[PDB]
Amino acid sequence: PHELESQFILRLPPEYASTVRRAVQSGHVNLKDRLTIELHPDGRHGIVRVDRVPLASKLVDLPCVMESLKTIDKKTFYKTADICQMLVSTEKKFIWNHGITLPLKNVRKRRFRKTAKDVEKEVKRLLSTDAEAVSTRWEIIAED
């Protein structure tokens, strides 16, 4: 079978980003030894090791949706993957408010329309507790 590839964006500190960029544009396999990525079983924490120097990482959710688009002639572009996550290196904490481009900053707060009426999972847990019970008493309340 075929499994859709999973692309994400890696953001590094600027000096380490310059060393990683120089090693990528060089093209040797020396970069392979220099750059490693260890993702912790939390799922939202990691180490990126640049030149064997550990950096602390967080995998965050991006507010917009990006899409990688490949081309052969630079006139027709084929969508290859959807990017929604970034492993910035240096829950509410795992949500990034800004977008990658310069015009998109504070997009989640300002350029996103918010419509409102985790919570569903809590309601399911409450229903399960009511089922495991015997007698349930309920009242919409006031200030108390």
């Binding site: 499994e3 964006i9 590094l12 600027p14 310059s18 990528v24 544009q25 750059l35 970034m86 492993l87």
Partner: peptide, 18 residues
């Protein structure tokens, strides 16, 4: 941005493009 690269992960390993 000058800091962002693109990591393509598959089952076999990680790959990096600028």
């Amino acid at each position: 941005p000058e800091t962002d690269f693109l990591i393509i992960r598959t089952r076999q390993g990680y790959y990096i493009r600028e």
